[PDB]
Every structure is written in structure tokens, then in C-alpha cells.
Amino acid sequence: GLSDGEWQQVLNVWGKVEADIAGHGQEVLIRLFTGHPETLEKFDKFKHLKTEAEMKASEDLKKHGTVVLTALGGILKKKGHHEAELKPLAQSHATKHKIPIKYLEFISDAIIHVLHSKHPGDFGADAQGAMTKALELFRNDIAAKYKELGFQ
Numbered sequence: 001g002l003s004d005g006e007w008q009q010v011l012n013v014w015g016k017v018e019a020d021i022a023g024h025g026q027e028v029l030i031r032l033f034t035g036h037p038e039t040l041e042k043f044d045k046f047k048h049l050k051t052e053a054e055m056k057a058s059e060d061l062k063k064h065g066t067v068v069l070t071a072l073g074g075i076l077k078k079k080g081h082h083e084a085e086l087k088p089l090a091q092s093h094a095t096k097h098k099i100p101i102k103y104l105e106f107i108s109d110a111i112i113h114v115l116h117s118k119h120p121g122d123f124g125a126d127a128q129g130a131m132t133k134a135l136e137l138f139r140n141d142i143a144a145k146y147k148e149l150g151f152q
């Protein structure tokens, strides 16, 4: 649950992402894959990437970063009223991709890391607080659907 002022901060931060969605999406995925190499094994289409240079050179990885961040942005713009948008993603991630909730924690922290890396000094303490709460709400509503499905 976020206040109106917190949502305003989230959507202000998101404007930084929307100016270069593919560059942000690329770096989020590279941070996830290099920090947590077990996450790469869930992607049949990326497991061939052995080095970060190959990851950086991969246009398909940048494409997938765009898909991921476009979906997240659509959810964030609902300011918590995201049941219809979140349900299919929860269902596909539990039943088809088999993504443990832990990996959604990893990607949440990776988003915070990338924002500080690309906008140093321009991602303030209030903005980090609001973004973190928004990613927690997203993860918590996914977790509720995971529990319904019995997925661990």
C-alpha cells in the first residue's frame, strides 16, 4: 500500500527508465545474470551466454529487457490496481517458467542497483523508498498467487 505521494515518486523515477527502456532493461538483466548465475539457467534462449561481453552484445537480451520493463511499467502505472495485469504473469511464471519468488526478489534489488548506477546522485532516498515499496507490493501480490497454486 502506497500513498499518492509515493506513487508520484515511483512514476517520476519511471520516467527515467522510459527515456531508455532498452538500455535499462539490458542492464537489469545483466545485473541479474552476473550476480545470480542460476537465474540464467531458466532461460533456454540465454543459457549459451558465457561472458558478460556476450551478454552486452546480445540484441535478443536487450529485446527481452524491453519486454520485461514494458510489462512492469504497465503494472506500476496502475498504482496498485493491477489484478488483471498481474494474474497472467504470476500464472506463467509459476506454471510455465517455474521462477521461484526468490528470483523476483533478486530482480527487484537489481532494478534499484541499476537506477543508482545510471543516475548517481539523482535517485534520492525518498525515491528509493517509494520504488522499493512498489516492487515489494508487486512481489507480494505474485506471492499470493504462487501460494494459491502451491508453487515453491
Ligand code: HEM
Pocket: 039, 040, 042, 043, 044, 045, 067, 068, 069, 071, 072, 088, 089, 092, 093, 097, 099, 103, 104, 107
Ligand atoms: C519484474 C519482473 C518480471 C517481469 C515484469 C517479467 C515479465 C515477463 C514477460 C512479459 C514475459 C513474456 C510473457 C510471459 O511469458 O508471461 C516474460 C518471460 C519470461 N520470464 Fe519474466 N518477468 C519478470 C521477472 C523474471 C525473472 C526474475 C525471471 C527468471 C529469473 C524471469 C524469467 C522469464 C522467462 C524464462 C521467460 C520466458 C523467456 C522466453 O523464452 O522467451 N522473469 N517475463
